[PDB]
Amino acid sequence: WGAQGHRLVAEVADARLNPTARAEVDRLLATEPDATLASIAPWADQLRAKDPGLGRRSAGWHYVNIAEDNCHYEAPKHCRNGNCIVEALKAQSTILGDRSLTDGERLQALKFVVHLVGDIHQPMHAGYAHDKGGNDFQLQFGNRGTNLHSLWDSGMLNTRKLDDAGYLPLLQSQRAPKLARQSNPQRDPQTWAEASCRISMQAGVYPATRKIGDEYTERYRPLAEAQLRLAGENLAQLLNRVLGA
Numbered sequence: 001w002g003a004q005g006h007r008l009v010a011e012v013a014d015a016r017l018n019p020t021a022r023a024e025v026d027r028l029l030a031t032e033p034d035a036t037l038a039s040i041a042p043w044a045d046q047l048r049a050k051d052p053g054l055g056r057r058s059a060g061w062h063y064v065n066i067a068e069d070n071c072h073y074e075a076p077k078h079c080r081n082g083n084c085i086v087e088a089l090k091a092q093s094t095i096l097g098d099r100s101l102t103d104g105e106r107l108q109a110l111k112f113v114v115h116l117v118g119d120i121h122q123p124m125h126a127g128y129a130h131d132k133g134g135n136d137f138q139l140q141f142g143n144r145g146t147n148l149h150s151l152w153d154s155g156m157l158n159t160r161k162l163d164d165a166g167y168l169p170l171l172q173s174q175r176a177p178k179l180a181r182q183s184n185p186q187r188d189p190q191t192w193a194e195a196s197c198r199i200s201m202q203a204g205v206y207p208a209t210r211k212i213g214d215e216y217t218e219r220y221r222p223l224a225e226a227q228l229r230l231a232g233e234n235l236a237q238l239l240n241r242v243l244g245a
């Protein structure tokens, strides 16, 4: 997602934290002045200005290309060197839960976990290798030149013309998604990436025309918004388990 999508996932999650996780999240955040779960949510996309080395090191962690393999993830094939979102989310969840680390080390892991739970729910972050997750599927969207990846990251969300305070209660007023009975931090990332990939492969998500507009928005913006709500609920359930026991 773009930055607004990341912040909305965090804002949905923040309100669903249990008291234990609330307290520990606030304590980790307070080690960095002005940090909130929302403000840190875009951080992993913004590393070029102040931590370009980490940005280079972690750029592959934002996606996994499994649509060629019918949305059946295999770590050795799809995640060489741990360089994909499934293995990165698993590792950063472990690091976040390691109370023996410094606050700085745990906060960095929190920033990755918040971002990556968002990205692993963006269908085009779990799509085809051969068109770079839709980046090479060129579109005109209300006449603007774009691509299917960007359309899902921000194009459709931008059509609401809402700030976070207007968009958040829209997401919260949706029907509640049915979550797993418990967080499994090491198994859930694969489940989520495969679910996202299956959306990318649904008939119509790749549109029949390159010229699209309101018809596509009216059909699929609700699904993008459902995915933001689902990501936020999944992020809260994960933080409640890792930080809230």
Ligand SMILES: [Zn+2]
Pocket: 001, 002, 006, 045, 118, 119, 122
């Ligand atoms: Zn994103």
Ligand SMILES: [Zn+2]
Pocket: 001, 002, 125, 149, 153
């Ligand atoms: Zn993206």
Ligand SMILES: [Zn+2]
Pocket: 001, 044, 045, 062, 115, 119
């Ligand atoms: Zn990202």
